[PDB]
């Protein structure tokens, strides 16, 4: 009865990981590109490639994908996050300031890059997604919800992950 | 230098602010009719009786409003905050389900009646705002960013009210 508050808080992992699924098959889609493991997703985004190449998919105009830092991820495949990757976020931030999305879902360039709020960045993913979508400038993100599963080990992991 | 980070949570603050006031009058907008002070608009839209009409704003066919608790907010200014409220808040989840806004967006009924997380509700009712002004069922929600003022006061309650 009071183990159930736990399994609470395995329904908040589960959740969070389809979002993430979601996430990561949406921007494929529109990259033409695969992108890390769903459980790795986070981590990935973390560089900020990604996301300059996704602001570069609806907003060419503002990023440059040869103005990208370390567009292979060689750099950080090799050593590992470097300042210089925090432009790529910048990027992305800027391409969404560029299309109109509202500044409310915006996260900071810390919340990813230093991975101090990725769920934020996760969530204004599903906003722009939603929005780009509205102006028929990508295709419409998916409902995984009840449709995917993950393996206990992947829901504790995402359950320890999100508690500290 | 150091004093550096209170400017930062100040400005956090000051931005969430914003982002009230643009759902206040938006909501205002939607309702015909005046909604709390954006200083209390977030205890205002606790008993769900605002977002209720909201509800029937755009999915009349599954928000009656006859069927409202405490419609006038009657028993709310005499007495609390009532469980039957509660109702109020799922019938606005059954609306913003029946138009298909993602499931993502929206807060549990705990995050507004017990005002566990109602940040969370104010980020849905903007990512909603987005998506009726999609359909053409609403106007579009201002962005008053650096448009609007609070005193320093103001700003300091929100402040260390988002903190602890």
């Known amino acids: 009865a009071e183990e159930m508050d736990e399994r609470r808080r395995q329904n908040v992992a589960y959740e969070y990981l389809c ?22 997703l986070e981590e990935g985004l973390r560089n900020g490639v990604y996301l300059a190449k996704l602001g570069n998919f609806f907003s060419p105009k503002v990023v440059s994908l040869k103005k990208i830092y370390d567009r292979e991820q060689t750099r950080y495949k090799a050593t590992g996050l470097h300042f210089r990757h925090t432009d790529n976020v910048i990027q992305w931030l800027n391409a ?40 028929g400038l990508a295709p419409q993100i998916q409902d995984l919800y009840g449709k995917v599963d993950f393996t206990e080990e992947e829901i504790n992991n995402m359950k320890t992950e999100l508690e500290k």
């Open 19 to 40: 979002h993430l699924e979601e996430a990561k098959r949406w921007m494929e889609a529109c990259l033409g590109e695969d992108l890390p493991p769903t459980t790795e």
């Open 96 to 135: 969404m300031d560029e299309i109109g999305l509202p500044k409310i879902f915006y996260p900071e360039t810390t919340d990813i890059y230093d991975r101090k709020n990725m769920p934020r960045c996760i969530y204004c993913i599903h906003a722009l997604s939603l929005y780009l979508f509205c102006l």
